[PDB]
Design a protein around this ligand. Sequence first.
Ligand SMILES: Cc1cn([C@H]2CCCN(Cc3ccc(C(=O)O)c(Oc4cccc(C(F)(F)F)c4)c3)C2)c(=O)[nH]c1=O
Length: 191
Amino acid sequence: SAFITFEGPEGSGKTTVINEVYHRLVKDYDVIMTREPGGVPTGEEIRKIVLEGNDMDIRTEAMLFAASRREHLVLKVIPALKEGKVVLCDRYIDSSLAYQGYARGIGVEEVRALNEFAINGLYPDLTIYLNVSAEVGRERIIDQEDLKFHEKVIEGYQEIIHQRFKSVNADQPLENVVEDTYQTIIKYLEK
Ligand SMILES: Cc1cn([C@H]2CCCN(Cc3ccc(C(=O)O)c(Oc4cccc(C(F)(F)F)c4)c3)C2)c(=O)[nH]c1=O
């Protein structure tokens, strides 16, 4: 079994990369693709609070992402790993660190402590960081506030990334991003 997370800002080609890598890995491994809340009822109820209300305090939002993360881990990820599956997870602890910790300004260390409570030692075995420049990312997506937030997210990921992390150059055409990500994963799985 293996727990592999995928991280990156918007415009990194993360959705395409995970889907293509899943279609290639399924030939040789029992693999599943997931994201939080991923159908877990409690996580889905939390997601409705976050989305359908109520122009939220950033710390309350961080705690709700962390609570959805725990429910998804306990009810979906852990049982799949017990069946010997390769779990491909779109966003995990690092997204809370970059978005809530860095970009939203709570502080990475405060958000880290919150997330360590939520995951209780269950760190990914491997984390693919889709390293896109802000400029290429901006082009893949298509105001000043959105652009600045996109840049801060990238800045946050850079601070976080500085052992389980494997940075893939996401400025390349997507076929190459897919190939580099697939090769990184197979090297880890076959080791
Ligand atoms: C995992 C994670 C992600 N993001 C960002 C990434 C970029 C998109 N952002 C907006 C965004 C976009 C779509 C949705 C939707 O799913 O439709 C959405 O909602 C939820 C997503 C995941 C979990 C929950 C639940 F509430 F359940 F925790 C709600 C939020 C969310 C953080 O900021 N921190 C984190 O930890």
